[PDB]
Amino acid sequence: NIINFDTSLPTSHTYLGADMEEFHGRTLHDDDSCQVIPVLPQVMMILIPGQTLPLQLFHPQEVSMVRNLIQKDRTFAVLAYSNVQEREAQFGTTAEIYAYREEQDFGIEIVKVKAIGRQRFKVLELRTQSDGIQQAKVQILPECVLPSTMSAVQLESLNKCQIFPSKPVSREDQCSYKWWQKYQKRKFHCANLTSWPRWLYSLYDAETLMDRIKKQLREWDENLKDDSLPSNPIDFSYRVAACLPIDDVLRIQLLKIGSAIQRLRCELDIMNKCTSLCCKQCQETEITTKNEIFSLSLCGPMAAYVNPHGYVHETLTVYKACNLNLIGRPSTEHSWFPGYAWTVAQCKICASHIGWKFTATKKDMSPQKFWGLTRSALLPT
Amino acid sequence: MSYNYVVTAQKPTAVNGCVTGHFTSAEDLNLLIAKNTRLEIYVVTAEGLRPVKEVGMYGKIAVMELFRPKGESKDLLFILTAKYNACILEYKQSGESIDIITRAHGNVQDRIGRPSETGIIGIIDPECRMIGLRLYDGLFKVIPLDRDNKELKAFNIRLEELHVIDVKFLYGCQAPTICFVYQDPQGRHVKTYEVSLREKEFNKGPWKQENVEAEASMVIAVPEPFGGAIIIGQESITYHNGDKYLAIAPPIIKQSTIVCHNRVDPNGSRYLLGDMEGRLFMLLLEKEEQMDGTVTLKDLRVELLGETSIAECLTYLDNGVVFVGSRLGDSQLVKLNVDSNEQGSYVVAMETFTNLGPIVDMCVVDLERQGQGQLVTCSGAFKEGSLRIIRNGKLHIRTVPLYESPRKICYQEVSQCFGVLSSRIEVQDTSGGTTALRPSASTQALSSSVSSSKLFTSFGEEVEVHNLLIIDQHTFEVLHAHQFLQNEYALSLVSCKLGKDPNTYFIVGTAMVYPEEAEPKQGRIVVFQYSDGKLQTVAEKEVKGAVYSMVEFNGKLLASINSTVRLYEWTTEKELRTECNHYNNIMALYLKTKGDFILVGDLMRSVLLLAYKPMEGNFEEIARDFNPNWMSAVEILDDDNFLGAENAFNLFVCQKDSAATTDEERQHLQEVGLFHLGEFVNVFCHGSLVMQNLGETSTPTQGSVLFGTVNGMIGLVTSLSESWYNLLLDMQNRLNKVIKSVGKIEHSFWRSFHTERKTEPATGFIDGDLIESFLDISRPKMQEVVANLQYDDGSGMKREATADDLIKVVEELTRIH
Ligand SMILES: Nc1cccc2c1C(=O)N([C@H]1CCC(=O)NC1=O)C2=O
Ligand SMILES: [Zn+2]
């Protein structure tokens, strides 16, 4: 099922605004060194690079910093806070501004800005400024890319038999199990010179790991092959890491890794060894059905969404969610999705403010089969 | 703070390129063999090959083609190094001190750009108008060649296609022409460009792009008067000339594809083709057509000649003698007699040059009466694997062929027999069985056995069947051949005694592999016990994972199942028992131990250290080191320093600083020494080739670690005293201003730490070859070598330092190998 809804509008966040002032992206950094960057407070979320984030700011100090940044380099630091609060952070990710809008209307501060992370860095000490926008020293962490594992011992003879033909058709049986055997037998042909077999080198390759991740993802949900999954291992790893339902400590551990292959192996291990989900205070929940989780968006099952009253909020698009209670009529005055009506779905035991059931609005839609969860009270077990 | 000393004992013998041309003189015919860091110039005669020179460059040879610019009497030589140290060498006989002067030198690498995935390609215009290269994707580098060009300035030219398979210049054209095949989603095509030097840009090719077979790999340029290029694929050998087009699909070359070639005639009427399986094809061109003075092809028949060593680079010498240069086997010199035909084979062996590599695993054994030591290696691969014995008393090397690839080795003494694993190729016949291909050493043993345990396709596909051989140390004949179950893969092998038991047990760790699943799920540890010429399975334990490497602890057995390091205790009931576990974040591949220190590595450089506290009985984690690189082999030099190899043929030494006053610094491993060895290291093992006499005061060297390499050279890395390192560093930094290397490549470059992302100067390592080369330098230059060395540190200085004292110093370091 595809429930006949375009999944590119929830990524653009139409509800936030319409007449956006687009900012063209050109920005990089020192490339393995250090810099200094303003930090926006009142935000607590680890931002994997490539993940979109919308922001809503009300106090004068941060909006003044926003205008100053707009008339400057477009970058601000979001420190990945640990479990302990009160500036107990060591790693942060920079954020880039690609769209801005005032929409002052009544007017207190009122800013309509969406941001995406670009790079990773570490903080030595958190310098404090009395203005309100603390600035920190920052060592731009490296992005280490590794060459092919077979390039060290490669023969000068069979150098030419290393560019394989493209995949046969796409996403078909007997065109992958048959083709991957030939791929492994031909690409890693010089594995006999070293003291290790071919499959061991296959465990530390880039293409095979990405194919396995893609197969697992399509086993989860109906993904249209190359539905905005970049062929580059870096961006693919970042996107898949962003779209997984994992705790914050494991996410910061993934952020710690600086190499694509190690990150992919660790992520594969994590989502292979993670099956169950919990309701924080509650002992257990029906959300354990990790297999039955589709993605009603182009960014994945998870994305960053904002509320009209403050802090950014997290979501999880699950097909069915039991152990929940529904309160309030279905309303869509401020909906995270254009053609959906949101209903505040509370819990059944702990009664936490987690869950949002979406009902039918049109004919070719999903009638009363949609939910949005919260990682604040959701933890893998 | 490492003070290590790396020296080369047996010079590398692998071959990665051979060309012929009138190099030494216009009348002689030379066979320049490019091995690796060394270059050898031979002279062909009626009897065979007569060596002339052994010249060693400061780099790895990657491109070597001979060209003859106008106005030259003898052919020059063009050599490109992996580190892009381009140079043009010219041979010159000066009396009897034959030296190779350097015509030009200069780096050609670009500041930014990923190296091509296919690899470096070197091509030269037949008219010697320019020199071509392909170093980075989409950048076909061109180096103009002129008498005034003594710096090798290169200008990039943009290639319209990124994935380029093979590019080689064409013959018989007024303007320079290239003919290359590229990869596109719509398929593979052959397209040509007319490179112009004046415009420094491409042009329109003589003949348009033509579709080719989906497995086009290698391109041969046919010389005059035919013209055009021959595109050889997995199934067909084609020919393109624009209007003309010939293609044939013989079934003989169907089994394996062709990877190497070399012309045999000035007009290219016949050709040579080699493949991985190891058979020498013989392509023929029919030139009987002659319409109006032009010559065109009529037939592309392919005729097989016979089976030789596994080809890496061929060459056709005079009088029908073909140098079948191998890389993973043994080099040969076959004769193409078309009149013998003993049974249908056109090739007969004449000579055999020893080729140690590719070494896979090693052991040091005193096979004589407790005298010297003897590096019993596991050379070869595919059908040419063999056991080599390397003594020190020039190194003498005797071969024991097995016709089967060996993986590891170990030497039990209380049964005076060797234990070597093996892996031979078995073809899947359409009957459910496993029929062999050739008589291998596993099927010709005195006895045999087949493992039978109950604890748990297509006709044409190949399946690997593993064996564990037992070889006597005297006759070197196979005595028994134990064979594991179907789809079982042998990884580890250790010969050690366990617990209080008096016997010596062969232990083999195996991990089942299935095509369906990616990583192994269940493995097996089997404990054999050789006695009275009969292998018996005393014990058998199953593990949910893969057994990657194993060692012994003074009566205990240690194994690394998947990502967990496990300790096994040998009980009195002869059944392995688990004692303690340590779940690691990495997958433990290498286990090297010394005392209570455990050096747990992986394939991604993540060196991790462990210490086994006996009072508590569980592992404790001491040191950490994380850095993304491909670590090849790791060895523990001493109680503190750990040695290993990593990407770009480098050597690194890590040191743990127990003197640090903070816990944050103690839990981290410094990088003290980095070195660019120039070889890929496969295995490390303790021991030395020289008699281990006490020697009263011994020598400045202390300790001994040997390493084997893919190219097959034996090195001896040791430790040094504090002042000796500074003295040797000063001597080495003064030697660079006396000796003149070939190509002018600077020593610090050929030894600088190299990586695709970062390069730093080498420290903590003394090059043993540069120091050992001092004894060959002429006496008058020795005065310039040393003038203020401050020779003694202990008890005097002798500022003058004379000249004879340094000779004694170098000889003491040379005596170790
Ligand atoms: N905590 C509050 C408080 C008031 C209103 C809303 C929320 C909230 O989370 N959303 C979501 C509901 C889900 C949706 O579709 N759009 C929203 O803004 C609201 O409208
Ligand atoms: Zn609850």
Q: Where do the structural domains in chain A lie, given as residue ranges? A: 16-140, 198-273, 275-381
Whether the bond into B700 is cis, omega within 30 of 0? no
Q: By C-alpha distance, which of B152, B219, B217, B142 is closest to B179? A: B219
Rg (CA), chain B: 29
For chain B, where do the domains classified as CATH 2.130.10.10 start and end? 4-353, 361-719
Contacts of A272 by beta carbon, 8 Å cutoff, 6+ apart = none
Q: Give yes or no for a contact between A248 and A194, defined as CB atoms under 8 angstroms apart.
A: no
CA A307 to ligand 1 centroid distance, Å: 5
DSSP B457-493: --TT-EEEEEEEEEEETTT--EEEEEE--TTEEEEEE
**3-state SS string for B655-683:** EECCCCCCHHHHCCEEEEEEEECCCCEEE
CA A381 to ligand 2 centroid distance, Å: 14
B765-767/B4-10 β-pairing = parallel
CA A16 to ligand 2 centroid distance, Å: 30
Distance (Å, whole) CA B177 – CA B175: 6
Distance (Å, whole) CA B773 – CA B814: 10
A108 touches chain B (CB under 8 A): no
Distance (Å, whole) CA B356 – CA B359: 7
Name B323's bridge partners: none
Q: CB-based burial of residue A166 (10 Å sphere; 0-12 exposed, 13-18 middle, 19+ buried)? A: exposed
The token duo for A184 is 């492994």
Q: Does domain B361-719 have CATH number 1.10.3720.10?
A: no
B677 touches chain A (CB under 8 A): no
Q: Give yes or no for a contact between B264 and B270, defined as CB atoms under 8 angstroms apart.
A: yes
> What's the Cα-to-Cα distance from A176 to each of A80, A208, A211, B514, rounded to whole Å?
39, 11, 10, 15
Q: In this complex, do B118 and A162 lie within 8 Å of one another by their Cβ atoms? A: yes
DSSP A11-39: HHTGGG-SS-EE--------SSS-EEEEB
The token duo for B295 is 């010559």
B38-44/B49-56 β-pairing = antiparallel
B195 touches chain A (CB under 8 A): no
What is the CATH code of the structural domain delimited by A16-140?
2.30.130.40
Contacts of A79 by beta carbon, 8 Å cutoff, 6+ apart = A39, A87, A89, A91, A92, A123, A126, A136
- In the 8-state DSSP scheme, what is residue B36? S
Measured from the Cβ of residue A306, the count of other Cβ atoms closer than 10 Å reads 20
Distance of alpha carbon B44 from the chain centroid: 27
For chain B, where do the domains classified as CATH 1.10.150.910 start and end? 722-815
Direct distance between the N- and C-terminal alpha carbons of chain B, in angstroms, rounded to an integer: 24
Distance (Å, whole) CA A229 – CA A297: 13
Distance (Å, whole) CA A364 – CA A3: 6
Direct distance between the N- and C-terminal alpha carbons of chain A, in angstroms, rounded to an integer: 29
Distance (Å, whole) CA B232 – CA B220: 8
User: Which is the closest atom of ligand 1 to the Cα of A333?
Assistant: 20
Q: Give yes or no for a contact between B32 and B16, defined as CB atoms under 8 angstroms apart.
A: no
DSSP A98-167: EEE----TT-SS---EEEEEEEEEE-S-----TTS--EEEEEE---B----TTSSS--SSTTSTT-PPPP
Distance of alpha carbon A315 from the chain centroid: 11
Q: By C-alpha distance, which of B231, B239, B285, B240 is closest to B258? A: B231
Q: Which of 465-524 (B) contact A at CB < 8 A?
A: 489, 491, 513, 515-516, 518-520
Which experimental method was this entry solved with? cryo-EM
> What's the Cα-to-Cα distance from B424 to each of A354, B135, B248, B257, B402, rounded to whole Å?
60, 37, 33, 20, 10
> What's the Cα-to-Cα distance from B513 to each of B506, B520, B522, B524, rounded to whole Å?
22, 5, 9, 12
- In the 8-state DSSP scheme, what is residue B83? T
Contacts of B62 in chain A (CB under 8 A): 156
Contacts of A154 in chain B (CB under 8 A): 119
A212 → closest Cβ in B358, B518, B632: B518
> What's the Cα-to-Cα distance from B144 to each of B68, B80, B134, rounded to whole Å?
15, 15, 14
- Count how many Cα atoms sit within 13 Å of the Cα of residue B622 in the half-sphere of its side chain: 19
A161 → closest Cβ in B217, B519, B710: B217
For A10, the enclosing helix (H) or strand (E) is helix A9-12
A366 touches chain B (CB under 8 A): no
Q: Is the CB of A76 under 6 A from ligand 1?
A: no
Q: Give yes or no for a contact between B619 and B628, defined as CB atoms under 8 angstroms apart.
A: no
Q: Give yes or no for a contact between B576 and B558, defined as CB atoms under 8 angstroms apart.
A: no
Give the CATH number of domain A198-273; options: 1.50.40.10, 1.10.1740.10, 1.20.58.1480, 3.50.50.60. 1.20.58.1480
Exposure pattern of B417-433 as b/e (b: 16+ CB <10 Å)? bbbbbbbbbbebeeeee
Name B660's bridge partners: none
Largest Cα–Cα distance of chain A, in whole Å?
73
Give the three-class secondary structure for B494: strand
Q: Does domain B4-353 have CATH number 2.130.10.10?
A: yes
Q: In this complex, do B407 and A166 lie within 8 Å of one another by their Cβ atoms? A: no
Q: Which amino acid is at B108?
A: V
Q: Give the strand order in the sheet containing B362-365.
A: B362-365, B374-379, B386-390, B397-401
Total length of chain B: 817
B635 touches chain A (CB under 8 A): no
The token duo for A49 is 């690079």
Total length of chain A: 381
Q: Give yes or no for a contact between B448 and B533, defined as CB atoms under 8 angstroms apart.
A: no
Q: Does domain B722-815 have CATH number 1.10.150.910?
A: yes
Q: Give the strand order in the sheet containing B714-719.
A: B681-686, B702-709, B714-719, B4-10, B765-767
Residue A213 dihedral angles phi and psi, to the nearest 5°: -65, -40
Distance (Å, whole) CA B240 – CA B521: 51
CA B173 to ligand 2 centroid distance, Å: 81
Q: Give yes or no for a contact between B680 and B16, defined as CB atoms under 8 angstroms apart.
A: no
Q: Give yes or no for a contact between A153 and A190, defined as CB atoms under 8 angstroms apart.
A: yes
Structurally, what CATH architecture does the domain formed by A275-381 represent?
Beta Complex (2.170)
Q: By C-alpha distance, which of A237, A165, A172 is closest to A206? A: A237
Q: Which of 389-418 (B) contact A at CB < 8 A?
A: 405, 407-408
Q: By C-alpha distance, which of B471, B525, B449, B482 is closest to B363? A: B471
Q: Give the strand order in the sheet containing B347-353.
A: B321-322, B331-336, B347-353
Q: Give yes or no for a contact between B528 and B482, defined as CB atoms under 8 angstroms apart.
A: yes
Give the three-class secondary structure for A170: coil
Q: By C-alpha distance, which of B592, B648, B645, B586 is closest to B765? A: B645
Distance (Å, whole) CA A271 – CA A302: 15
Q: By C-alpha distance, which of B375, B382, B305 is closest to B347? A: B305
Tell me what percent of chain A is helix, strand and coil, each rounded to the nearest 5.
Answer: 25, 20, 55
Distance (Å, whole) CA B511 – CA B509: 7
Contacts of A208 in chain B (CB under 8 A): 518
Distance (Å, whole) CA B631 – CA B587: 13
Place of tokens 């366990």: B498
Handedness of CA B95, B99, B100, B103 (dihedral sign): negative
Per the annotation, binding residues of A for Zn(2+) are 279, 282, 347, 350
